[PDB]
Amino acid sequence: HHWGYGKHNGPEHWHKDFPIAKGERQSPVDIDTHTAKYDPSLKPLSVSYDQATSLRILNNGHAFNVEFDDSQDKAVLKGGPLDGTYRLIQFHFHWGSLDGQGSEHTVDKKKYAAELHLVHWNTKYGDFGKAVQQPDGLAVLGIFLKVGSAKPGLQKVVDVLDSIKTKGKSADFTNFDPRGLLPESLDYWTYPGSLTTPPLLECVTWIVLKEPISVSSEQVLKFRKLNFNGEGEPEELMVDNWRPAQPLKNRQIKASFK
Ligand SMILES: [Zn+2]
């Protein structure tokens, strides 16, 4: 009876195994654009992905992760609200069964069709497993996906999904450039939060980009053909793998832009 996104094990149940689900800095949240505070002290983001080395793509039973070599400062995030250097370890998406839902964060209650999370860890803690135990351990760049024109830089991901249809499958996935997934503008909101899946640790500085990327209906349809289940188990489509918005509590969302 593992956690998941179903009727009997979904987000409303997670607090029984993970009591931090009811904590003070849980994610995602609704971003109220009119009460977000413009902070002129916030620096521009510095995304240095030119030397990124992707390794593999994996269906882990709740999403698919594209994993990167994080043994050196090859793909790093700096600047913005961050102190120090954060190394990219993996990216994954959350998506819906329908185009009108799928994102985890919302903007003035608006849901997008999907949300991309680029997960980075603070190099001062030496490895990802130690970083998640620290309040400043991770930085997650969140990018919204809306349905419209196709995103050419996403197609290489879409075309490999047939190889990792079921939980536990992996495929080699080298030479993928994550720069093809970024919007034109790097304006952002930021707030302190958590992982949005168990163990729900409160270790994330969230950086949510204002500008969505567009993907085609055909691209997102292919996400919805993945399976939560392993091979030979009954088929359950991997859809609606998003956590609903959590209370903001004593937190202020800051904006890098007016
Ligand atoms: Zn995520």
UniProtKB/Swiss-Prot annotation:
Result for mutant: K16E: In Jogjakarta
Keyword Metal-binding: yes
Keywords in alphabetical order: Acetylation, Cell membrane, Cytoplasm, Disease variant, Lyase, Membrane, Metal-binding, Osteopetrosis, Phosphoprotein, Zinc
Result after altering V140 to F/Y: Strongly impaired activity
Outcome of mutating Y5F: Enhanced activity
Enzyme Commission number(s) of this protein: 4.2.1.1, 4.2.1.69
Result when mutating N60D: Strongly reduced activity
Protein name per UniProt: Carbonic anhydrase 2
Entry keyword Cytoplasm: yes
InterPro entries for the chain: CA_dom, CA_dom_sf, Carbonic_anhydrase_a-class, Carbonic_anhydrase_a-class_CS
Organism: Homo sapiens
Active-site residues, record numbering mapped to chain: H62
